[PDB]
Amino acid sequence: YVNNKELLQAIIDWKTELANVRQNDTIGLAIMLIAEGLSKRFNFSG
DNA sequence: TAAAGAGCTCAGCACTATTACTGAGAGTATAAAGATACTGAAGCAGCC
Numbered sequence: 001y002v003n004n005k006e007l008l009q010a011i012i013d014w015k016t017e018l019a020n021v022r023q024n025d026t027i028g029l030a031i032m033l034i035a036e037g038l039s040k041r042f043n044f045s046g
Numbered sequence: 047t048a049a050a051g052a053g054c055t056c057a058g059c060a061c062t063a064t065t066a067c068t069g070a071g072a073g074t075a076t077a078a079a080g081a082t083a084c085t086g087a088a089g090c091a092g093c094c
Contacts, residue, residue: 038077042079043079
C-alpha cells in the first residue's frame with residue numbers, strides 16, 4: 001500500500017504543529033487505504 | 047362469675063437505599079491480506 005516511513009513523518013509533523021486547527025489528509029487518505037485493505041483480510045470479508 | 051377495659055405484638059401494604067450489573071469508553075503500536083427478449087428513448091456520434 002503505502003510507505004510506513006512517510007507516515008511516521010507526517011504524524012511527527014502534526015505532533016509538532018499540535019504543539020502550537022486541522023491535520024494533513026495524506027495520513028488520512030492512508031488511513032482509509034489501510035482500513036479498506038485490512039477489510040480484505042481473510043477472517044473478515046466473508 | 048364474666049362482660050368489659052387498655053395494651054403486646056404479629057399479618058399485611060410501602061420505601062429507600064442497595065447491589066449486581068449491564069452498558070459506554072477508552073486505551074489498543076506483526077502483518078500490507080457471469081446462458082430472456084423486446085420495445086423504446088435520449089445521448090452520442092459522424093455529415094453536407
